Amino acid sequence: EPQVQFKLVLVGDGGTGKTTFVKRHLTGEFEKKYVATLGVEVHPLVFHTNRGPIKFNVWDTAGQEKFGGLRDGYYIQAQCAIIMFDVTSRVTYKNVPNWHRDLVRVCENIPIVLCGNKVDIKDRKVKAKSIVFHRKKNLQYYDISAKSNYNFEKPFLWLARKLIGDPNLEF
């Protein structure tokens, strides 16, 4: 039904919360256990906007190299992307440039949102100060939390405005 739909590739280090983030959108439930994704899982997410139903086909990829292997082949014909990292794990932020690099290898120019997940957790290792890759690459950045729903929709809303090219789009 929705006639406006986009391939969205969701990448980032293992355990940063990518699947939890998507499941939360899909069903509203929060999954507590970590069950690594194998390769990719494709989930359609439909947003009801003031410009109609917008569908993001979310390609939830595997962050653990051992389950990835061919991840890069999922990038093909993606129209937008989310790079996720974990605000409580400095290493995930340190890998952001590698994720970014690989995505643009395939998807030349395409809107990308950088998300720092798990801001619901007390001891932040990646402080707002640290986070500046978005400035060096013109990416949109957001703090998010799959657990508390903080800025839950911001990444999709931003991408929607960008891809429809209408700043008045509202969810």
């Binding site: 390609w59 653990q64 093909i76 700043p167």
Partner: protein, 1013 residues
């Protein structure tokens, strides 16, 4: 390839794309499981597809897969590598889609390698393609040189930077920077010379109106500054002037302007001395960030939209947000020395503009620069307030909010000096923004800024402003918007510490406003907390006017569908501190949830190797490795267990006998099992402190007590030998002490006394050993002293027998911390004439200790000599009476803080000897003793001295004063009889002689003296 192979692979690669998980999973198994035996065929295929397939999806995927699988090329037969190379290259030079040529180039790059054979046909293909009339050929060749910069090892790049295709230019620049990225510095000066051609190419992008492509070039240039800032030295002014020009041209789209800003910003992070040696940088940087910070509320002069929204940031204000963090970043790197001047040159101007956006911008710019420039601005502080505070009343609410922001920010950044010197200007300013005349956003932000200020302000400074603060915040409390209610409750709770007394005044209007908010988990909790803090502040009787309502909302809140839950518990607890035993009927509502949590088991489970690598993503769990295995505890759950126990313990403490109902269950299911929580010492400690408190709860209510105590003591004692943490061992002795004190006389049995001795010895032994390796140790031994002593007393000496078996250990200690220990033990021994067996083993060392240069050793020593005379009068006279002269000397910096304690025990020690052997002494002595009064610091000593003073009854004014001093210094107490003896002496003197003695004393101690005599 065989034609069969092709259609199987082609199907798989096509299916590799379904968004559909089945079609694509089937192809996934097929690739991974069916396709060392087949890999060369597969690589040869995917290279063929990418090169020759007419289908775009297939061609792209194959090129991408080929590159990916190649890194998973060196182990491939050379005949096949060559064929792969040749087809990739034929593909490249044929007719292909742009994005496919890009992906071919990516795949080609995976075929060039240090260990791989030379491929001079590639080199030749690149040079030709760079001269092709097709941009995509040119662009794609640079892309290859980017990925494999070694192929590079001048007119090519200069033609590149100048190319009519933007795409080619961006790729030229990308390749140019990639060289520095990948090669060592020794190679850098070889392309370095090209930087001016590159920089000189830049104005052309603005002429053609190609600012998106400019942004990409700025991205590359940003990377280059972070690698080789010095390369830019000669043209630094030129790049500064160029970025300035871009940013000011505000018909350009944001990306060229935001990336230009980032280019500017990044010089401060990578060459601070370069920036500092050039006044142009500072001036340009401040100017451009100021201009961008005015780009707010565009096409909305009233700020209607901003006034109507919540107190979060508007993410549409991109350039503004970028400019804020840029100015902050540069200021932090360069300092105020360098930036204050250029900063202020501009602020002075913009504070006075007729455009509101510029008055705002000025506030936000100061806000951004303040921390980094603190080294200078912490002194130009009146000047800053002279600019800022006038704007607090700007006709425009966003300029107002802006001014609040600065006052908030600098209250933090220039603290505590700003609190001392500008409270008189800052507080009234912020407080005036609280009135409901102002807009919601401004009231809220001013209220926030009062928190920054209060954080580092003394209660004395805040005091005259509190009623004003409070009356205004109550009005904020009545707003219909939650972000104001919440911020108001944050401030009232921040101020509740000071206003502990000024609530009674505001109570009757505040408390119902609070109850209405409760009738936003964060809101409700903060509201609860204000409510119960106000209730404590105004005391129980006034709290009763709404206690029943508050209670019933709390009860409903706890039983409704975790930040809040920690507020309910703290509040329930504060209500208990108000209500006293009137809380009793609430227990069955409040306690059971606490019991559930406090009964969590330690949950240790086997994690699997590999699963341990990822457990790093459960932060409530912790993992340890034991042998070849890993085990995990749910640590968070056990922290919560401690939390619950801390609450149950403070319930038991407050409610005394009233808590008895819970004692057995809490004792047996919570306190005692907690002693076995081997992975978690918080638990173990909480378990131990609970024990004596539970017993004293059951005692106050009423064999059960005895059973529980026998169980609890034995688990405590058992813990002593096994416990790894000496901090915990100290808790267990403390807990035994406190238990013995609750339970009384002869509360331990013989096995217990033996098991205790072993424990003590294993603890003494390890303390010795830790210290023959080098407060923690002093304190433990302090407690072991207490438990030995506590145990001695309940046995009434009988523990003397056990005490021996460990006498060698004690004796080693005797011959400073180990010494003090031992001396203190021996004093306790004597207190309970059956120690003769040991007299000979210690008095030589005790008598030595008497004259020790260490006060603490003398103290413990003289105490021993004094206790000898008191409890073992006759088995010790050959010692006490000789040493007596030594004591008269130790007695004489004696009356000085450091050794006041030691000389007071000696004093009491001689008073003890004088008592035991009353007229069997060779009497000067008692007059010596007397000159050692008053006893004002050691309480047990003072207790004996004034008893002895009272047995005995020129030196009357000194007799009286001796007692006045002890009472007033609170060393003998509870002002509870030597006074009776003194009043009799004063009885035998006239009205006027009696009076005159107190003539020296000031009013306050004469008030007390009247109530003493």
């Amino acid at each position: 390839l065989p034609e069969e192979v092709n259609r199987t692979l082609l199907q798989i690669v096509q299916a590799f794309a379904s968004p559909d998980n089945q079609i694509r999973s089937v192809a996934e198994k097929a690739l991974s499981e069916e396709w060392e035996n087949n890999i060369e065929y597969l690589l040869t295929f995917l290279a063929e597809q990418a090169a020759f397939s007419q289908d775009t999806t297939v061609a792209a995927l194959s090129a991408v897969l080929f590159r990916k699988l190649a890194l998973k090329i060196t182990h491939i037969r050379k005949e096949v590598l060559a064929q792969i190379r040749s087809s990739l290259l034929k593909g490249f030079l044929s007719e292909r889609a742009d994005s496919i040529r890009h992906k071919l180039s990516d795949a080609i790059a995976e075929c060039v390698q240090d260990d791989l054979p030379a491929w001079p046909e590639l080199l030749q293909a690149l040079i030709e393609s760079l001269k092709s009339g097709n941009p995509n050929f040119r662009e794609s060749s640079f892309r290859i040189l980017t990925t494999v910069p070694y192929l590079i090892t001048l007119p090519i790049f200069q033609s590149g930077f100048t190319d009519a295709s933007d795409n080619v230019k961006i790729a030229a620049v990308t390749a140019f920077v990639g060289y520095f990225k990948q090669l060592p510095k020794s190679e850098w000066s070889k392309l370095g010379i090209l930087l001016p051609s590159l920089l000189n190419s830049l104005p052309r992008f603005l002429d053609d109106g190609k600012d998106d492509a400019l942004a990409s070039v700025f991205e590359s240039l940003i990377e280059l500054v972070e690698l080789a800032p010095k390369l830019f030295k000669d043209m630094f002014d030129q790049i500064i002037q160029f970025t300035d020009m871009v940013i000011k041209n505000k018909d350009l789209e944001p990306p060229a302007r935001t990336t230009a800003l980032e280019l500017l910003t990044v010089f401060s992070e990578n060459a601070p001395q370069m920036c500092k040696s050039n006044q142009n940088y500072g001036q340009t940087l401040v100017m451009v960030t100021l201009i961008m910070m005015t780009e707010v509320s565009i096409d909305d002069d009233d700020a209607a939209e901003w006034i109507e929204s919540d107190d979060t940031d508007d993410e549409e204000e991109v350039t503004y947000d970028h400019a804020r963090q840029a100015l902050d970043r540069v200021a932090l790197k360069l300092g105020g020395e360098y930036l204050a001047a250029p900063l202020f040159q501009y602020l002075q101007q913009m504070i006075t503009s007729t455009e509101w956006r510029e008055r705002f911008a000025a506030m936000m710019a100061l806000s951004s620069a303040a921390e980094g420039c603190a080294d200078v601005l912490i002194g130009e502080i009146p000047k800053i307030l002279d600019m800022v505070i006038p704007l607090i009343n700007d006709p425009h609410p966003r300029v107002q909010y802006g001014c609040c922001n600065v006052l908030g920010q600098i209250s933090t950044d220039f603290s505590p000096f700003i609190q001392r010197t500008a409270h008189d200007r800052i507080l009234p300013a912020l407080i005036s923004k609280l009135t409901s005349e102002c807009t919601s956003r401004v009231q809220t932000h001013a209220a926030a800024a009062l928190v920054n200020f209060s954080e580092f302000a003394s209660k004395d400074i805040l005091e005259p402003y509190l009623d004003s603060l409070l009356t205004n915040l109550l009005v904020l409390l009545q707003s219909n918007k939650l972000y104001v209610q919440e911020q108001a409750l944050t401030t009232i709770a921040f101020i509740a510490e000071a206003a502990k007394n000024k609530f009674i005044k505001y109570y009757d209007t505040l408390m119902p406003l609070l109850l209405n908010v409760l009738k936003n988990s964060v809101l409700k909790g903060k509201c609860m907390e204000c409510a119960t803090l106000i209730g404590f502040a105004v005391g129980k009787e006034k709290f009763h006017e709404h206690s029943q309502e508050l209670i019933s909302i709390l009860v409903a809140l706890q039983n409704s569908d975790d930040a809040l839950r920690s507020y309910l518990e703290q509040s329930w607890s504060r209500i208990c501190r108000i209500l006293g035993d009137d809380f009793v009927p609430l227990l069955p509502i409040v306690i059971p949830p606490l019991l559930i949590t406090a009964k969590a088991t330690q949950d240790v489970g086997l994690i699997e190797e590999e699963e341990a690598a990822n457990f790093q993503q459960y932060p409530d769990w912790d993992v340890v490795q034991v042998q070849g295995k890993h085990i995990a505890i749910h640590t968070s759950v056990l922290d919560d267990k401690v939390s619950a126990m801390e609450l149950l313990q403070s319930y038991a403490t407050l409610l005394r006998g009233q808590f008895a109902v819970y004692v057995k269950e809490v004792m047996e299911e919570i306190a005692l099992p907690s002693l076995d929580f081997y992975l978690h010492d918080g638990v173990r400690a909480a378990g131990a402190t609970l024990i004596p408190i539970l017993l004293s709860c059951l005692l106050a209510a009423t064999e059960e007590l005895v059973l529980l105590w026998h169980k609890a003591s034995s688990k405590l004692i058992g813990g002593l030998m096994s416990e790894p943490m000496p901090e915990i061992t100290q808790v267990y002795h403390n807990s035994l002490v406190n238990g013995i004190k609750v339970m009384g006389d002869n509360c331990l049995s013989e096995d217990q006394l033996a098991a205790f001795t072993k424990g003590v010895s294993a603890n003494l032994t390890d303390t010795y050993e830790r210290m023959q390796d080098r407060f923690t140790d002093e304190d433990l031994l302090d407690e072991i002293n207490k438990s030995i002593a506590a145990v001695l007393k309940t046995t009434n000496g009988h523990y003397l027998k056990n005490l021996e078996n460990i006498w060698p250990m004690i004796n080693t200690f005797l011959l400073p911390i180990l010494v003090i220990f031992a001396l203190v033990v021996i004093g306790d021994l004597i207190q309970y004439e059956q120690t003769a067996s040991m007299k000979n083993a210690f008095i030589p060392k005790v008598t030595e200790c008497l004259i020790s240069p260490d006060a603490r050793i003398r103290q413990a020593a003289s105490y021993i000599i004094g206790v000898c005379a008191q409890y073992a009068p006759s088995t010790y006279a050959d010692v006490c009476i000789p040493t007596l002269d030594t004591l008269v000397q130790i007695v004489d910096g004696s009356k000085l803080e450091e050794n006041r304690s030691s000389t007071e025990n000696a004093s009491a020690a001689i008073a003890k000897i004088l008592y035991a052997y009353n007229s069997n002494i060779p009497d000067t002595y008692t007059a010596n003793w007397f000159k050692t009064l008053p006893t004002i610091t050691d309480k047990e000593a003072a207790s004996f001295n004034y008893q002895f003073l009272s047995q005995l009854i020129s030196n009357i004014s000194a007799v009286v004063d001796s007692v006045i001093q002890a009472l007033n210094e609170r060393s003998l107490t509870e002002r509870e009889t030597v006074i009776s003896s003194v009043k009799k002496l004063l009885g035998f003197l006239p009205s006027s002689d009696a009076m005159a003695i107190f003539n020296r004393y000031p009013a306050d101690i004469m008030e007390k003296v009247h109530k003493w005599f």
